[PDB]
Structures are given as C-alpha cells and as structure tokens.
Design a protein around this ligand. Structure first.
Ligand code: TVC
Ligand code: CL
Length: 242
C-alpha cells in the first residue's frame, strides 16, 4: 500500500534538481514517495551494486572477512582514496570500484547471474562485461526494487549465510548517534544516460526501521552531496530524524 506526497518535490526544486525519494515504514508496512512513476523506473545501480557484490564475494569465500586487505595494484587513478590498500569496510566507504571489479572477475559470470536471480535483484541481467556490467551493462533496478532487496538483507532472508549478511550490514554503516543509525550505500552513474546519483539504505530507530531509496539527476559531480542532504530533509520533514 502506497501513498504519493508531491510536497517532497520542493526539496528537489529548491536545489534546481529532479528525483525521487521512496520511504518504507516497516512497522506499518506502508510506503511513501514523491513520484510513483520514477519510483518504479529502472536505472543502473552503479556503486549501490557493492551491496550484493559484497554479499556474493563473502558467501563464496572470495572475501574471507572484513579485515582481509586488498592491496592497491599500483595503477594511479584520479580518485586519491583509491590509490591505497583497502578492506571491505573502507572499500565500501570510498566506493573503491577497482577492488569490486576484481571481486566480480573472481565471482564469475555464472555464479554472479545465479546469485542475482536468487536475490531477485533488479532485472537480474548481467549482460555486458563481468567487471563493469553494473556501470555500463544491462543490469537495472528501481528505487522500490532497492527497498525490497534491502528489507530482505535487514531480516537476514537473502539466500546467503547470516554471517555474510551481518558483515555487509556492518560495512554499510554510515552514520550513528544517540537518535538513529543509518546503514546505506551511495551510487553515481555516469556511463549511460540519464546521469544519476543513488542513496539507498535504512534508518534504525529504537522502535522501528525506515527503509529509503532515492535517485536524482546528476549532470555534474558538484551535486553529489544532495543525495544525502535531500534524503535527510525528507526524513526531517516526516519527523523520522530530529
Ligand atoms: O559516490 C559514489 O557512490 C561513487 C561511486 C563510484 C565512483 C564515484 C566517483 C567517480 C568519479 C568522480 C568524479 C568527480 C567527483 C567525484 C567522483 C566520484 C562515486
Ligand atoms: Cl555495526
């Protein structure tokens, strides 16, 4: 059951942008969004794919645990934080594509495809290069589809071990204070139009969980901070966070 609240569009327009925020109240099993059409439009997941990618790599033993070090390959890239050693935690924190590209190559197309179908993840289509299909291949996912996937992750209901799901939820940790915990993952899609940014995850409260998934137009990297800012303004508006 779903309600459309066009008043949230103000948060996008104030910043001369366009996008969708989708909220899900777990206690009440009710969803909310500013744009039901865009809520169900499928986009490239980009670095939000690092969630399913981590789960599969851990569950197959490609990644031993969250401490295993993935050594920088020595190739200088334009993102400074990528030119260093990483573990699962920091690789997630800094969206370190090269690390996850090597995961995908070791996972393999066959096992990746099988796992994404078991996850019911998006259109489950890995068409393209195994090490970049989530950036410029055929895989697509909508904001509402992100929520269904995330809800299964939260409840340890995905078809991987509980350990794998706990580790990935730890690596998703983004913000925590006395009022809430946010576990989430950002995304930035540029190789295929329209260029968008993602932010998907959930807000843990004492007595409830609010799942969220947003995407917005991102013609330039200058607006990437709006992914979190716009999401948080909606959360504040709905009195989910002070
Ligand atoms: O936020 C992310 O989720 C993310 C995921 C993957 C890559 C990048 C990325 C890539 C190129 C950039 C260029 C200019 C400024 C920032 C840039 C950031 C960000
Ligand atoms: Cl944690």
């Amino acid at each position: 059951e779903w309600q459309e609240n066009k008043s949230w569009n103000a948060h996008f327009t104030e910043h001369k942008s366009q996008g969708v925020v989708v909220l899900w109240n777990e206690n009440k099993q009710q969803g909310f969004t500013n744009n039901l059409k865009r809520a169900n439009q499928a986009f490239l997941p980009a670095s939000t794919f690092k969630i399913p990618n981590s789960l599969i790599a851990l569950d197959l033993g490609v990644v031993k645990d969250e401490h295993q070090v993935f050594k920088w390959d020595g190739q200088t890239r334009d993102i400074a934080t990528w030119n260093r050693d990483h573990n699962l935690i920091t690789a997630m924190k800094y969206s370190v594509v090269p690390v996850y590209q090597e995961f995908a190559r070791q996972i393999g197309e066959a096992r990746m495809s099988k796992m994404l179908h078991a996850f019911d993840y998006g259109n489950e289509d890995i068409s393209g290069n195994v090490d970049s299909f989530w950036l410029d291949g055929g895989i697509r996912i909508s904001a509402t589809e992100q929520i269904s996937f995330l809800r299964k992750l939260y409840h340890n209901k995905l078809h991987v071990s509980e350990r794998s799901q706990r580790i990935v939820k730890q690596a998703m940790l983004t913000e925590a204070n006395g009022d809430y915990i946010i576990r989430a993952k950002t995304g930035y899609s540029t190789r295929i139009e329209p260029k968008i940014g993602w932010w998907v995850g959930w807000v843990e409260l004492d007595d409830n969980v609010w799942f969220f998934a947003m995407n917005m137009d991102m013609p330039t990297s200058d607006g990437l901070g709006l992914r979190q800012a716009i999401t948080k303004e909606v959360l504040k508006q709905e009195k989910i966070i002070p």
